[PDB]
C-alpha cells in the first residue's frame, strides 16, 4: 500500500468516526425523549385498565371479550419496524420471529395478513411472497396518538368486520440501553385483565351493551399506542449502541492505519537515502 492510499483511508475513517459519534449523541437525546414520553403515557393506561377491569366482569356479550369470538380463520399480524437502517438487529430479530411463526403455524397464504409500520417491513414482506393489507410509513420521532389513530381505527374495525379473527402484534421491548427483547402479545380477542379494588368502576353503571360498543375499541387503540412508544425507545437505544460500536471500530482502524503509515514513511526515507548514497559513492 502507498502513502497516498493510506492517508486517504485514514481521512475517510476519521470523517466516518466523527459522523457516527454525532449520531450516537443525537440518538441518546432521542432515547431520553422517548423514555419521558413513555413515562407520561402511564396514567391513561392506568385509568383505562382500571375501568375495563371493573366493567369486564359483566355479561360480556360483545364480540371482542369473547374467548373465541370466531373460530380459526384468517389471522391479522401487526408488526412495528423502523424507517431507516443502522439500528443493528432491531428489524432483523422481529422479522425473523414473525417469519418463523407464520411459517411454522400457518403454512398457507390465505389465512394470514400483515399490518406493518415502518418501510423496512414493507420491503421485507414485498421481497417475500407476503400479502400485506394495511401500510403506514412516515411517522415522527416522538409519535403521538393522533398520528396513526387513523390506522389503529382501521385495524380494530377489520376485526370488528370479520375480515380476520385473530390479532397478534410484534415489537421490540425496551429493557436497557444494551438489551432489547422481541415481544409477542395477543391483542384480540380480549382475554384477561387485572385484579384489585374490584367493582369500584360500575357505580354509575349506564346501560352495559351500549357502553361496551365504545369502551372496547378504545382499549385496543391504547394497546397499539403503548406498543409504539416502547418500539421507538428500543429503536433509539439500538441506534445509540450501534453508533457507539461503529465509532469504536473506526477509532481502532484509524490507529492501525496510522501505525502502518508511519512504518511506510520510515521505509521510504530509508530507501531514498540508501539510493542517494549508493549513487554518490558509485563514482
Amino acid at each position: 500500500a502507498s502513502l497516498r492510499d493510506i492517508k486517504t483511508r485514514i481521512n475517510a475513517t476519521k470523517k466516518t468516526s466523527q459522523i457516527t459519534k454525532a449520531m450516537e449523541m443525537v440518538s441518546t437525546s432521542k432515547l431520553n425523549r422517548a423514555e419521558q414520553n413513555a413515562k407520561s403515557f402511564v396514567p391513561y393506561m392506568e385509568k383505562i385498565q382500571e375501568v375495563v377491569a371493573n366493567v369486564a366482569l359483566g355479561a360480556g356479550g360483545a364480540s371482542h371479550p369473547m374467548l373465541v369470538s370466531r373460530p380459526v380463520k384468517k389471522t391479522g399480524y401487526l408488526v412495528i419496524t423502523s424507517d431507516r437502517g443502522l439500528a443493528g438487529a432491531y428489524n432483523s430479530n422481529v422479522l425473523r420471529l414473525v417469519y418463523q411463526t407464520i411459517q411454522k403455524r400457518h403454512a398457507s397464504p390465505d389465512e394470514y395478513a400483515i399490518i406493518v409500520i415502518g418501510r423496512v417491513g414493507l420491503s421485507f414482506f414485498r421481497k417475500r411472497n407476503m400479502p400485506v393489507i394495511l401500510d403506514i410509513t412516515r411517522l415522527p420521532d416522538q409519535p403521538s396518538f393522533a398520528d396513526i389513530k387513523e390506522i389503529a381505527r382501521k385495524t380494530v374495525g377489520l376485526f370488528a368486520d370479520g375480515t380476520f379473527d385473530e390479532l397478534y402484534m410484534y415489537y421490540n421491548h425496551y429493557v436497557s440501553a444494551i438489551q432489547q427483547e422481541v415481544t409477542e402479545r395477543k391483542l384480540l380477542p380480549l382475554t384477561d385483565l387485572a385484579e384489585n379494588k374490584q367493582r369500584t368502576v360500575y357505580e354509575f353503571e349506564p346501560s352495559q351493551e351500549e357502553i361496551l360498543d365504545v369502551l372496547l375499541p378504545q382499549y385496543a387503540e391504547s394497546l397499539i399506542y403503548g406498543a409504539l412508544l416502547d418500539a421507538k425507545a428500543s429503536e433509539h437505544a439500538a441506534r445509540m449502541t450501534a453508533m457507539k460500536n461503529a465509532t469504536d471500530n473506526a477509532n481502532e482502524l484509524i490507529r492501525t492505519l496510522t501505525l502502518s503509515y508511519n512504518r511506510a514513511r520510515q521505509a521510504a526515507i530509508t530507501q531514498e537515502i540508501t539510493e542517494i548514497v549508493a549513487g554518490a559513492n558509485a563514482l
Partner: protein, 119 residues
C-alpha cells in the same frame, strides 16, 4: 485570468459557486460510501444532486474524439457555458436524469438527449 476585472463579475461568481459546490461534494463521498445517502440531510442530498449533474455537464465531445465516440464534436462559447452552468446552479434541470449530461455540449443538447430516453 480568473479575476473580476479580467473576466467579469457574473462569470467569476458562477465559477466560484461551481467550485464551492464541487468542494462540498468531494467531502460527502467518504461518508456516503459507508453510511449511504439515506443518512444525509436534505441540504446535502440536494448538494450531491446538483454536484453530480454539474460534474457530468463539465464533459464535452471533441471534434478529434470522433474515433473514440462516434458522435461528432461541438464548439461551445463562453457566454453559453456560463449561462448553462448558472441554470444548473439555480436548479432548473433537477428533474433531468444525470446521464443526459454526458458529452453533450450545451444544455439544449442535454434536454434534447433526454427526449431519447423518454424524459
Amino acid at each position: 485570468a480568473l479575476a473580476p476585472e479580467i473576466v467579469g463579475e457574473e462569470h467569476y461568481q458562477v465559477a466560484r459557486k461551481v467550485q464551492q459546490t464541487l468542494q462540498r461534494y468531494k467531502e460527502l463521498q467518504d461518508i456516503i460510501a459507508i453510511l449511504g445517502m439515506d443518512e444525509l440531510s436534505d441540504e446535502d442530498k440536494l448538494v450531491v444532486h446538483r454536484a453530480r449533474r454539474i460534474q457530468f455537464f463539465l464533459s464535452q465531445n471533441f471534434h478529434v474524439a470522433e474515433q473514440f465516440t462516434g458522435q461528432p464534436g461541438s464548439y461551445v462559447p463562453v457566454k453559453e457555458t456560463v449561462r448553462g452552468f448558472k441554470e444548473i446552479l439555480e436548479g432548473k434541470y433537477d428533474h433531468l436524469p444525470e446521464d443526459a449530461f454526458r458529452l453533450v455540449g450545451r444544455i439544449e443538447e442535454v434536454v434534447e438527449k433526454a427526449k431519447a430516453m423518454g424524459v
